[PDB]
Amino acid sequence: MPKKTIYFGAGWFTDRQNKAYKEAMEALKENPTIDLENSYVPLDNQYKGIRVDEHPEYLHDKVWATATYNNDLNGIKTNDIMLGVYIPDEEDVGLGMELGYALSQGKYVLLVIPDEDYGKPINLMSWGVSDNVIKMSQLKDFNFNKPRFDFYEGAVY
Amino acid sequence: MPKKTIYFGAGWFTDRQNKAYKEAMEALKENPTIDLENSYVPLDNQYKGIRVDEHPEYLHDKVWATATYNNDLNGIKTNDIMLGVYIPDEEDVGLGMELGYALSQGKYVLLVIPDEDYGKPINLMSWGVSDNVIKMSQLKDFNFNKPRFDFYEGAVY
Amino acid sequence: MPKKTIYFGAGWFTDRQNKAYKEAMEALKENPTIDLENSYVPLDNQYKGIRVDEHPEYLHDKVWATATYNNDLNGIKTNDIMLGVYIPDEEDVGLGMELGYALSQGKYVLLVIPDEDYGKPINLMSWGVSDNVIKMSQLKDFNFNKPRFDFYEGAVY
Amino acid sequence: MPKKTIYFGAGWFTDRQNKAYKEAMEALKENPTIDLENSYVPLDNQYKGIRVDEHPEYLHDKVWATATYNNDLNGIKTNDIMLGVYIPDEEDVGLGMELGYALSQGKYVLLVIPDEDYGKPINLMSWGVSDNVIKMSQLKDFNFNKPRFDFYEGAVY
Amino acid sequence: MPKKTIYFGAGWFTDRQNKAYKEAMEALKENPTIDLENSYVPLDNQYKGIRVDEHPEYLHDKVWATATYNNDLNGIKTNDIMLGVYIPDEEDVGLGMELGYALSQGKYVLLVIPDEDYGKPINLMSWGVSDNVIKMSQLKDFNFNKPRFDFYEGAVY
Amino acid sequence: MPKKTIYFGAGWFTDRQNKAYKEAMEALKENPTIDLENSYVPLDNQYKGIRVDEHPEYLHDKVWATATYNNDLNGIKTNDIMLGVYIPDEEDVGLGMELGYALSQGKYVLLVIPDEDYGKPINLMSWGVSDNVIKMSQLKDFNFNKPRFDFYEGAVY
Ligand SMILES: Nc1ccnc(=O)[nH]1
Ligand SMILES: Nc1ccnc(=O)[nH]1
Ligand SMILES: Nc1ccnc(=O)[nH]1
């Protein structure tokens, strides 16, 4: 079985983001086409091991910002697939940027929306950058070796 | 004396977006290094003239969405400079994507934040994609012929 | 008032190619948004002046081929706009490649089809690379300062 | 043994194209450096499973065209190697475009020409985009783990 | 009549660098196809005005280095043409990098070698990145509106 | 254990370059995250098997130069990781270019400096293109499956 690596594109700044984050991670553990061990998870790759939520002194540190921004870009570019955990009511400017960068690096761009939200309107530009969008409950079985383009079954705004 | 064109990256949903929109447009009218006539303004480039406010059925039409998404991308890629009107309290996933695309297309990426908001925290990836971020009040006089790299004087989360 | 440069993507082998070539060139002479003097016209940029019709031995010379191929690429990349004179009954693998390169270099990609042929089926990938496809008769007046995305009004196989 | 995936660049619109198509597919089955199971074959990845030759109603459907064009681009970008089954007397504008896109995505670009045709002149731009070109009868043994640049043993036009 | 901007890729450490620097600058002043005012000259764009000769402590500051590196990249990407003042006996790893970046950004890449040095061996990769290499004495009159591909008349190691 | 391939970026034109070359190669033999067999080593991939140091007749051969330049680019683009064996006192314009090309191809860019030299100032642009820089003695154990961004522990100039 060939396995692909991913970049774990996900916000961690609301309750629904954190729920979706936890679910997507569990799905990837169970997906046999994914090497999660060798995938890039931003939250474990922040500069110096520090997160600005737990250490607000780094809010103005430009070294921390430079290194953590660069590590994320590096995580996208050196992994096979771009994953975006996407909350339609709570869309993330950071993830938006990362989607655009992933496009520029020739990565498959897959959005995953919580089942409770799948079908709701999403930003036109998210719709467009995406190669495909699926429900959280499809993530454990998604075949990352044969990724295809498909349209969201949903509206844009 | 030489003038550059821009893509007008700006939301139009909320009150603060519309205020900033109006201000940024006024600033560009007054900036002698900008050819606004030949710049790309999304709101004046709605596909086939269809107005989605008066016909929201087109938000489920894949052709409408494809052409609108493509027009935006096209507007970024065929103009000199990427302008992002950025509201820190109302950060936009669509703008985020556009910023990343502009980076990939080799464009100068300039964010403009309302003076009332300049200093407030912005997403790390917005900070990083940007080549520079300035206050609305500096847009009138920004020299687009000699665009330089600088850091936001502000917080980043 | 501002003028853009183009790469003149057009075959010169067949009768229909040469007719379309002559027409497109005439249209560009008359278009006020085009600087034709500073555009790249392959046929006037033959390497070292060597004329391959009168010296076909150079078709086996790797240096001749390297420089000619590179000049074409260079002409696309250093000009504003990619123009493809496209004959639906005589589709050209070389033009196809040039279109893809122009896409990769962030250029507006405009196809022009003779009015007698506009509507006839074109290759799916030609349809897709293109930002727009127009009739020869619209080239005279095309505004290259405000190039927009649109779909071919025609069939695609 | 490491294996690479490919995009199966090949026309299917003439008798010689179909012959070459069949031969190249058989060669890939036998090549131990290729994972054919996880490779992208356009003809099995058309939108909705439908081919326009067998269902000409889709000749004007822009949804079908959008999705099938996008899936092909996605197939090139997410696979390791670009393969072009190339008939020198019957060159394909679609494949031409795909070669250019593959170049932009940093893929090895390999042309395969039927033995009966190998040596015949090929389009200059095909010659140039290519990293290498081989005979159909070399395809079963080509080592895709160690792909190198070489010149066609043949003319251009 | 139309003028193009450049990035002034040139070292300033050695005597030969400084001689060539002075000469190339003089040539560009006299070239009517160049807008030197709006070109990017590193030495006039030192970050925050800090002069590293008088304050070498900033060579250990990561913020200084980040901004300076980014300014250079920005200067290449937002100008029309990449100019590399190249000394064959004193080849520069930094210039090498800048050349590669300019290639990636779709810029014409022109090397200029002092006439006393034109013909001397240059690195294979310098030879290859370049679209053209000329003598200092030809810079005054180089037509930057019609930049063409050609080979160095000289040795390459 | 997943393995990655590399491009062996290294000069071979001084005694210290050759020492570092030999050491880096030995380190890669011992690194279990590297497939060295399928990696690209320039010195074994020169056109026709010939090196210009041992056959100076090829110093003016443009065919040799074209093919060997193109093979190196191909070696960077088809391998997972860009390695630069870097001597701070003896920096290489060729490697500089290759670093820039590797950046454009989305590759992890890793510099390796002899332990005797690690800490010495390096060119600003080398510092910036790099994703990370390590000592020769770290190379045998570097985990290429989880490559991260880090700052050089050293100065620039
Ligand atoms: N604090 C952060 C914001 C966005 N992305 C990150 O990786 N970290
Ligand atoms: N009908 C088609 C033409 C070209 N390419 C395809 O994948 N399909
Ligand atoms: N002679 C050479 C110089 C640079 N790079 C190479 O691969 N070969």
Author numbering:
A (entry chain A), B (entry chain B), C (entry chain B), D (entry chain A), E (entry chain B), F (entry chain A): 1 to 157
Give the published text.
A major challenge in the further development of nucleoside analogues for therapeutic applications is access to scalable and environmentally sustainable synthetic strategies. This study uses the type II nucleoside 2′-deoxyribosyltransferase from Lactobacillus leichmannii (LlNDT-2) to prepare a suite of ribonucleoside analogues using naturally-occurring uridine and cytidine sugar donors. An enzymatic alternative to the use of NPs to prepare ribonucleoside analogues is to use nucleoside 2′-deoxyribosyltransferases (NDTs). These enzymes catalyse the formation of nucleoside analogues via an overall nucleobase exchange much akin to NPs. However, NDTs are mechanistically distinct, forming a covalent adduct within the active site, thus controlling stereoselective nucleophilic attack of the incoming nucleobase on the β face.
To gain further insight into how the presence of a 2′-OH substituent on the ribonucleoside donor influences substrate recognition and subsequent catalytic steps, structural studies were conducted on the wildtype LlNDT-2 and a double mutant Y7F/D72N. To explore the structural implications of the differences between the two enzymes, WT-LlNDT-2 and the Y7F/D72N mutant were both crystallised using conditions determined for the WT-LlNDT-2 enzyme previously. Complexes were obtained by soaking cytidine 8 into the crystals. All structures contained two molecules in the asymmetric unit, constituting one third of the hexamer routinely observed in solution. In the case of WT-LlNDT-2, electron density in the omit maps obtained could be clearly modelled as the ribosylated intermediate, and the cleaved cytosine nucleobase, whereas in the Y7F/D72N structure cytidine 8 was intact, presumably reflective of its poorer kcat as observed for CtNDT. By contrast, the ribosylated intermediate of CtNDT reported by Tang and co-workers features the ribose flipped approximately 90° from this position, with the 2′-OH interacting with the side chain of D62 (D72 in LlNDT-2), despite the conservation of most active site residues, although the authors report multiple conformations of the ligand in this complex, evidenced by ambiguous electron density. Therefore, despite previous studies highlighting that WT-LlNDT-2 ribonucleosides are poor substrates, this can be overcome by increasing the enzyme loading.
